[PDB]
């Protein structure tokens, strides 16, 4: 941020501009004329570079780091694939009380809610996870040059009589259902859902592809519901791009 009393070199360092009028624009100061004291405490938007592929992404880590920047707006350039660590929590969540003036996602990779876990025995599959929960409306802006995907639902479980088997995990990386008999569904991969346990005409459901529900079992246990791409309030769409699952 710009700090006094050496406001001049401080704004040059913060903004990259020597001319005050152009430094003002970098600090989003729109008043004209302006008092240079109004620079103090303001920051140029921050730009984050993520090139670490992360299949265990925790939305609370991101919330903490955004809050650490206070009112400063944050641009995130996502250049490696990202998957939530669990289908019970979205990959990214933007709570209504975030302080940042705005957040921009520049998506250059595939980002995903986690696939849902396959069901076991008479239980349906579990729902796919959501990708983005947005509670700051148009203060979130999305430039999707990659994929935004809700996770696939898990397959429905299988049971007839005493035989119990598990459904496949939803894409990506959803867990296969683990039955009491170790008649288990397959875990999904990043790129494809997991197969349910199968025996001839008998089977537990397969996991769903991104943005889709899990398959029903041969015993009619239903698949988990599809995960959703963007949930909650509408962001500003710089580019909608490729989306699997519902959005707004």
């Amino acid at each position: 941020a710009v700090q006094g009393p050496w406001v001049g070199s401080s704004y040059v360092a913060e903004t990259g501009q020597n001319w005050a009028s152009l430094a003002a624009n970098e600090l989003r100061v729109t008043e004209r004329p302006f008092w240079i004291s109004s620079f103090i405490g303001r920051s140029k938007e921050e730009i984050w570079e993520w090139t670490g592929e992360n299949h265990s992404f925790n939305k609370d880590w991101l919330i903490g780091e955004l809050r650490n920047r206070g009112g400063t707006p944050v641009v995130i350039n996502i250049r490696a694939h990202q998957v939530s660590y669990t289908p019970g929590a979205p990959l990214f969540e933007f709570p209504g009380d975030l302080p940042n003036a705005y957040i921009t996602l520049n998506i250059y990779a595939d980002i995903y809610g986690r696939g849902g876990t396959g069901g076991v025995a008479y239980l349906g599959g579990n729902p796919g996870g959501d990708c983005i929960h947005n509670w700051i409306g148009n203060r979130l802006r999305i430039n999707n040059q990659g994929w935004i995907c809700g996770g696939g639902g898990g397959g429905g479980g299988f049971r007839v009589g005493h035989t119990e088997a598990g459904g496949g995990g939803g894409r990506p990386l959803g867990a296969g259902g683990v039955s009491s008999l170790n008649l288990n569904g397959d875990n999904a991969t990043l790129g494809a859902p997991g197969r349910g346990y199968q025996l001839g005409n008998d089977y537990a459901g397969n996991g769903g592809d991104v943005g889709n529900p899990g398959s029903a079992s041969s015993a009619e246990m239903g698949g988990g519901a599809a995960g959703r791409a963007v949930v909650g309030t509408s962001p500003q769409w710089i580019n909608v791009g490729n989306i699997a699952g519902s959005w707004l």
Partner: protein
């Protein structure tokens, strides 16, 4: 008196109106002062080769500012 030459007779200080002095160098009117202001004329510069200070409750006013 109306005109104070300082060395050459195109250079020095002269009457510029009531309570007004002009600062002159080789016939160029570089600036002047009156009861409220010391000033340069248009396109004539003020340069401190030390510090340049504004003290008290006033302020600096400009069109734009370049900090190197």
């Amino acid at each position: 008196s109306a005109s104070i030459a300082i060395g050459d007779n195109d250079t020095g200080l002269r009457w510029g109106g009531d309570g007004i002095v002009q600062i002159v160098a080789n016939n160029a009117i570089v600036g002047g002062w009156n009861s409220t202001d010391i000033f340069t004329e248009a396109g004539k510069h003020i340069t401190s080769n030390g510090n340049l200070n504004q003290w008290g409750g006033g302020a600096i006013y400009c069109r734009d500012l370049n900090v190197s």
